[PDB]
Amino acid sequence: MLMPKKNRIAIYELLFKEGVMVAKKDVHMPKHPELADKNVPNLHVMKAMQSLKSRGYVKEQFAWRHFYWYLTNEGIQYLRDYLHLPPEIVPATLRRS
Amino acid sequence: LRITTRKTPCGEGSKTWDRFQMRIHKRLIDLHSPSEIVKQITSISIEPGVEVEVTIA
Amino acid sequence: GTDLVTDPFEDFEFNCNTKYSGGVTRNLMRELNGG
Amino acid sequence: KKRKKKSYTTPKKNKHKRKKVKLAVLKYYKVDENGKISRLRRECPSDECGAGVFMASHFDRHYCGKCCLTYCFN
Amino acid sequence: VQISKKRKFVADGIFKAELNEFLTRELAEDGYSGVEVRVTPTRTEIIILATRTQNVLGEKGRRIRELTAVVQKRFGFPEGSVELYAEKVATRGLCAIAQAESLRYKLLGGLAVRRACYGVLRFIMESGAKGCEVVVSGKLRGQRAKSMKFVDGLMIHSGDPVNYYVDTAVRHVLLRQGVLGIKVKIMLPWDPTGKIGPKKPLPDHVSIVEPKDEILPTTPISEQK
RNA sequence: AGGAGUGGAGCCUGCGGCUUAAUUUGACUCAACACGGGAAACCUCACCCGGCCCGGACACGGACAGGAUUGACAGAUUGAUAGCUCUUUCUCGAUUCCGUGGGUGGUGGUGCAUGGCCGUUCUUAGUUGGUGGAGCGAUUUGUCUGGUUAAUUCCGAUAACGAACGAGACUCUGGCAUGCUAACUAGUUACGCGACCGGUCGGCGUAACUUCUUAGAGGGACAAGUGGCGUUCAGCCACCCGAGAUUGAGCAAUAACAGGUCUGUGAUGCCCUUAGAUGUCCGGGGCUGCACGCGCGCUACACUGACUGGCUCAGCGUGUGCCUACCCUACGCCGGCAGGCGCGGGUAACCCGUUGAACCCCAUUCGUGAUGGGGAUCGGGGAUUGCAAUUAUUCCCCAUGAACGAGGAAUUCCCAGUAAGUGCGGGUCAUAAGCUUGCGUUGAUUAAGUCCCUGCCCUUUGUACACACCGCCCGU
Numbered sequence: 001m002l003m004p005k006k007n008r009i010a011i012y013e014l015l016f017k018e019g020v021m022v023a024k025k026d027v028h029m030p031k032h033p034e035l036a037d038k039n040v041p042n043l044h045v046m047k048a049m050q051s052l053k054s055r056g057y058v059k060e061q062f063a064w065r066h067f068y069w070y071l072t073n074e075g076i077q078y079l080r081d082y083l084h085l086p087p088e089i090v091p092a093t094l095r096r097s
Numbered sequence: 098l099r100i101t102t103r104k105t106p107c108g109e110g111s112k113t114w115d116r117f118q119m120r121i122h123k124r125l126i127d128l129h130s131p132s133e134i135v136k137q138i139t140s141i142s143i144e145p146g147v148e149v150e151v152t153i154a
Numbered sequence: 155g156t157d158l159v160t161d162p163f164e165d166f167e168f169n170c171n172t173k174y175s176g177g178v179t180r181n182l183m184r185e186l187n188g189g
Numbered sequence: 190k191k192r193k194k195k196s197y198t199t200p201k202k203n204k205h206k207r208k209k210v211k212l213a214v215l216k217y218y219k220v221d222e223n224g225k226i227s228r229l230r231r232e233c234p235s236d237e238c239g240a241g242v243f244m245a246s247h248f249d250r251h252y253c254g255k256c257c258l259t260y261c262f263n
Numbered sequence: 264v265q266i267s268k269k270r271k272f273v274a275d276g277i278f279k280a281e282l283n284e285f286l287t288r289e290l291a292e293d294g295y296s297g298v299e300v301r302v303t304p305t306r307t308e309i310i311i312l313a314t315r316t317q318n319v320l321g322e323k324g325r326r327i328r329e330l331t332a333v334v335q336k337r338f339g340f341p342e343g344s345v346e347l348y349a350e351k352v353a354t355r356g357l358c359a360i361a362q363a364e365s366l367r368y369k370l371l372g373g374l375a376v377r378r379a380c381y382g383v384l385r386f387i388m389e390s391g392a393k394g395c396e397v398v399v400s401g402k403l404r405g406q407r408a409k410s411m412k413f414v415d416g417l418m419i420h421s422g423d424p425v426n427y428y429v430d431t432a433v434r435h436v437l438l439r440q441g442v443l444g445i446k447v448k449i450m451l452p453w454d455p456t457g458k459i460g461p462k463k464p465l466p467d468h469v470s471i472v473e474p475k476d477e478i479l480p481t482t483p484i485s486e487q488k
Numbered sequence: 489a490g491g492a493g494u495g496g497a498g499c500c501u502g503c504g505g506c507u508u509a510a511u512u513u514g515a516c517u518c519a520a521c522a523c524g525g526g527a528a529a530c531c532u533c534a535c536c537c538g539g540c541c542c543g544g545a546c547a548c549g550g551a552c553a554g555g556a557u558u559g560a561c562a563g564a565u566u567g568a569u570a571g572c573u574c575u576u577u578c579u580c581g582a583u584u585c586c587g588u589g590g591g592u593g594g595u596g597g598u599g600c601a602u603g604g605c606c607g608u609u610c611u612u613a614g615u616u617g618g619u620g621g622a623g624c625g626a627u628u629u630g631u632c633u634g635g636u637u638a639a640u641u642c643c644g645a646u647a648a649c650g651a652a653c654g655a656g657a658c659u660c661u662g663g664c665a666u667g668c669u670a671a672c673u674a675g676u677u678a679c680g681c682g683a684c685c686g687g688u689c690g691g692c693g694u695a696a697c698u699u700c701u702u703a704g705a706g707g708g709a710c711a712a713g714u715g716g717c718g719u720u721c722a723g724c725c726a727c728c729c730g731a732g733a734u735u736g737a738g739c740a741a742u743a744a745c746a747g748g749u750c751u752g753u754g755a756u757g758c759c760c761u762u763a764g765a766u767g768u769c770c771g772g773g774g775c776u777g778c779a780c781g782c783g784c785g786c787u788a789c790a791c792u793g794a795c796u797g798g799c800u801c802a803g804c805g806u807g808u809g810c811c812u813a814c815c816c817u818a819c820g821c822c823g824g825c826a827g828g829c830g831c832g833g834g835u836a837a838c839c840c841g842u843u844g845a846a847c848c849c850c851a852u853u854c855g856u857g858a859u860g861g862g863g864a865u866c867g868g869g870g871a872u873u874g875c876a877a878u879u880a881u882u883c884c885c886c887a888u889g890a891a892c893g894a895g896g897a898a899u900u901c902c903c904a905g906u907a908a909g910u911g912c913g914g915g916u917c918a919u920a921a922g923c924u925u926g927c928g929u930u931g932a933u934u935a936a937g938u939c940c941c942u943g944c945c946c947u948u949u950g951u952a953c954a955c956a957c958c959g960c961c962c963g964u
Contacts, residue, residue: 002542002767004580020329022337028768031811034339054592056545063288063754064281066337070329096328098269101915101925107749108524109515110607114925121272145301148271155439160404161375164411168403190513191535198538204586207556209577243578250560254578257560264810267835339810401602408602417652421740423659435603441757442603467657
C-alpha cells in the first residue's frame with residue numbers, strides 16, 4: 001500500500017475538516033500546487049487522500065489529470081460505515097442556503 | 098502564433114503536417130481624463146474575447 | 155455493459171450475404187407478415 | 190515483448206530471512222540482577238538526548254545507526 | 264503575476280478547453296451543450312448552456328454549488344470570484360453535441376440503431392436545419408465493424424463555409440462488445456440576426472431583389488380618396 | 489531534338505541474422521527504412537557484465553514485539569557513498585516477509601474485435617437519389633454526338649425533368665494605392681545650437697490628421713478594351729493599358745483498404761505476462777559501429793574562385809518566479825574578441841535589436857591555371873563551463889597536397905523570385921542539429937510540348953477474369 005499510519009490519522013482528520021476536494025493524479029509527488037501548507041509533507045498528504053477516496057467503495061470523477069470528488073450520500077454513508085464518526089462535527093456542506 | 102505538427106498520431110503515411118495559427122491583435126489608445134471618467138467609460142459591457150487593460154502614466 | 159438491439163430490417167441488410175442469410179431472411183419474413 | 194532476459198541464472202533462491210538471536214546481549218546485558226547497571230568508563234554527558242543513551246562496543250569502528258557514533262577522546 | 268500576451272492567451276484557451284471537457288464528462292447526461300466564459304472587472308462568469316437545467320442546478324442549487332466549488336478549487340480562482348450559471352439553449356435540434364448525446368442515450372437506452380438515428384434525423388430537420396448527416400461506425404453485430412451513414416437534406420463538405428455553416432460532433436458509446444462512434448453533422452440554416460445559425464449567406468448563392476411592381480393600363484386612371 | 493542540381497570532389501543517421509555481451513520493441517513497393525514528431529549516459533531503454541526496494545477489496549497455505557527495508561572511501565562483489573563481505577541491525581519502529589489470479593492497472597497481446605485520428609485509392613473529376621422513359625430482369629437513361637474548360641467547367645444537343653455532393657465559389661497569403669482612418673516605442677521639423685573663408689549636422693530636438701513602418705475600412709482585375717480564330721456560342725490567341733491579364737497554400741465527394749496507430753489517451757471489447765504493477769531505485773559496460781548488405785542526408789566546378797568590422801543589404805520569429813530557482817541578453821571582466829565574474833534591460837513595435845568574432849563584393853592576386861586559387865588525416869594559445877562527452881556539447885589560424893575543373897547498369901526532384909548556393913529562427917532542448925519545419929538573401933540554364941516510358945481520366949470494343957491478369961487455365 002506504501003502508506004504510514006500517523007500521516008494516515010492526520011489525513012483522516014484533514015478529510016473530515018474539508019470533505020470535498022479536487023486532487024491531481026500523482027503518487028510520489030510532494031509538490032502539488034493547490035494542496036500545500038498542511039503542516040505535513042505534501043507527498044504523504046496528497047497520496048493519502050487519494051487512497052482515502054479510492055478504497056473501492058467511494059466513487060470519483062476524473063479527467064485531464066485531476067480528481068474531482070463531490071460529497072454524495074455514498075461519501076457520507078462510507079464515512080459512517082468505516083470511521084463511525086457522526087456528522088455533528090458540522091462539515092462545510094450544511095451552509096449556503 | 099504558429100504551431101506545426103504531424104497530422105498522424107502514429108508515424109505512418111506520407112509526411113503531412115498541420116500548420117495551426119493564432120493571431121493576436123493589439124491596440125493602444127491614449128487620452129487625458131480623470132480616473133472617474135475612465136472607470137465610467139470602461140463599463141460598456143465589452144463583448145467576450147476582448148481583453149481590456151487600463152494603465153496610468 | 156449493454157448491447158445495442160437490431161431491427162430485423164438492419165439485420166437483413168447486414169447479413170444478407172453471410173452464414174446467417176437464411177436466418178435473417180426468415181426473421182425479416184416473420185416481421186413483414188407473421189400473423 | 191522483450192525483457193532483460195535474466196532468467197537462466199538463479200532459478201530458485203532461498204529466503205533472506207535472518208535468524209537473529211532473540212536474547213539481546215550486545216544491546217542490553219545485566220548479569221548483576223540490580224536496578225543500577227553502569228559502565229566502568231565515563232559516560233558521554235551530552236544532553237541533546239536522554240540520560241540513558243545506549244552505546245555498544247566492538248573491536249573497532251562500530252556502526253550505531255544514526256550517525257555511526259564512535260567512542261573517541263575528541 | 265506577470266505573463267506574456269501569447270502565453271496568457273494560450274493559457275486562457277487551455278483553461279477553456281479543460282473546463283469544457285471536465286463539465287462535458289460531468290453533466291453530459293444532463294444534455295450539456297456548451298460553455299462560455301466572460302472575464303470582466305472582478306466578475307468571471309461561466310455560462311453553461313444545456314438542454315435540461317433541472318439536474319444541472321439540481322435541488323436548491325446543490326449541483327451548481329458543487330460545480331462552482333470544484334472549478335474554483337481546481338483552477339485557483341479567488342474565493343467567490345467565479346460564479347457559474349446555467350441557461351437553456353433555444354434550439355436543441357441544431358447543436359451536434361446535444362443531438363449526438365441524445366442519439367447515444369437512445370442507443371444505450373435500448374432502440375434499433377436505424378430507428379434511433381432516423382428519429383434524431385427527423386428531429387434535426389423539423390428543428391429547421393438545412394440538412395443533416397449521422398454516421399454510426401463500429402460493431403453493428405458480428406466480428407467485422409460496419410459503418411452506416413444516413414444523410415438527409417443538403418450539406419457542404421469543402422471550403423471555408425464549413426466552419427460557420429456545418430456544426431459537427433463525435434461521441435463514443437461504450438457497449439458490452441466494444442466502442443461505437445456516432446458522428447453528427449448539421450448544416451445550419453441561413454439566418455440574419457438572432458444567432459440561431461450563421462449570419463453571412465453561402466458565398467455561391469446570389470440573391471436578387473424583385474424590381475418594383477408596375478401594373479398600369481393603357482390609360483392611367485388612379486384610385487383616389 | 490530539353491536541361492539544371494551528380495547517390496562518388498567542402499560535418500551522419502534510420503534498418504535488415506549471428507563475436508562470450510551491441511547491430512536495443514512498430515512500420516517493408518509506391519502507401520516501411522532522421523518515420524513513430526524516436527537528437528535513448530539517469531529519467532518515457534525494455535537484445536546491458538549480476539539484481540533491490542513493492543501486492544493486493546475476492547475463497548487462500550506459514551494464524552504477530554522483530555518475521556530486516558535504501559545509506560562504512562578502509563584488508564570486497566567483475567563496475568556501482570545501497571551494506572550481498574555467511575557479518576552488518578538506536579534513523580516510520582504496522583515500510584506487511586515466498587506463491588500463474590480478475591489488481592488503489594501494465595508502453596502486457598490482439599489495429600484480423602473496435603472508436604477516434606491519419607495515410608492512400610486519387611490531385612485526377614468524379615459520385616448519387618426522386619419522378620418520368622427502356623428492359624422479364626440484373627441494370628440503363630438522366631451522367632450525352634460535338635465544341636470548349638484546369639474541371640461532369642460551360643455552350644449546346646437531348647426521353648428526360650428537376651435536384652444533391654465534389655470542382656468552382658470560399659478562407660489565409662502575397663503583388664498596388666502621390667486616396668482614407670493616425671501612431672511620446674521605429675520614421676518629420678528652418679519662432680534651430682551641439683557651426684564662419686548665405687549647403688539639412690544622432691542619449692537630448694517629437695499646434696504635417698503620414699509619404700517610408702504598423703493595420704482597417706474600403707478600392708482594384710472582369711477575359712474588362714482592341715484585333716484575330718471559333719456554331720461567330722462557350723471559349724482560345726495576341727497586343728496596348730495596368731501593381732497585377734490565374735501568387736502560395738488551406739478546406740475538400742461517393743465507394744474502399746482486414747493500410748498505420750491498442751507504444752498518444754480513464755478511448756475501448758476480449759484474453760493474458762513478472763511479485764524488479766514501466767510503482768519506484770539522478771541504482772546498474774545495451775548505440776553511433778564503417779564488408780555503402782540497403783534508404784534519407786552532411787554536397788558549385790579559378791578574374792566569376794577570394795581579404796579594405798568594407799557606404800549595398802535580412803525576415804520569419806523566440807524570450808523569465810503557479811512544480812520554469814533549466815528564459816532572451818545589452819554594458820563593464822581583457823590572456824587576442826563568444827567568454828566562469830559583476831551590473832542593468834525586457835512578460836516585449838519598449839530590452840537583446842539599426843539582430844555581438846557574416847553574404848555576394850575588396851589592387852593579400854594569379855595576364856593563365858596544379859599558384860597566391862579554392863582544405864588532404866591532423867598538434868597548439870585561452871576552454872561557452874556538461875552527474876560522462878572518448879563510450880553524440882564546446883569556439884580563428886602555421887601551406888606537409890585533396891583522382892583539386894562534369895562521373896558503373898540503377899534511379900530522384902524540379903518551370904521564376906523557381907532549381908541551386910547561402911546563412912538565420914522554431915520544434916526537439918541545457919547553448920543542445922549533419923533532422924525537420926519555416927524565413928529571408930544571391931539567383932539562373934532549359935520548356936510553353938507530348939503520350940515514347942511510368943501512370944490517371946470521359947468513350948467504344950473483346951473477355952473462358954469477378955480472389956477481378958500477381959486472373960483463369962492447357963499437356964507428359
